[PDB]
């Protein structure tokens, strides 16, 4: 029912709303990278691809 | 204290 | 480092993505929802600078 | 397996 904070107590709740906001950023920031890595399996995938139909059509 | 400020959201 | 992933750590990864994802709406969600907590901070903070300045007004 | 894939991101 009161909600007048104290000086302190603002300053810790700004203070949290960037930390969560920085959690925020660096999972994002993260997951970028991970499909950076992800895409190389992809691709992986699709040179794996080549070789047996290069494979396939080299004994047809 | 009021419930569910910022902080209250753990992390 | 074999880029050629298997089914099994295929889908593991895919599923990775979405708790990924999910955590980071559940924690823009919270974060959201605190804003409303926090405005009704500021907004006590106002009810009381305008308390004083009647209170100050109202005693001449 | 390589290193930096979506899992491995702990959370």
Do not use: F
């Not at chain 1, 203070?15 to 969560?20: A, E, F, Q, R, Y």
């Not at chain 1, 906001?21 to 950076?36: G, Y």
């Not at chain 1, 691709?43 to 059509?57: C, G, M, T, V």
């Amino acid at each position: 029912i009161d909600h007048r904070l104290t000086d302190r107590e603002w300053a810790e709740e700004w203070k949290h709303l960037d930390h969560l906001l920085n959690c925020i950023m660096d999972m994002v920031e993260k997951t970028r990278r991970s499909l950076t890595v992800l895409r190389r399996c992809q691709e992986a995938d699709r040179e794996e691809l080549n070789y047996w139909i290069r494979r396939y059509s080299d004994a047809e | 204290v009021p419930p569910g400020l910022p902080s209250s959201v753990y992390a």
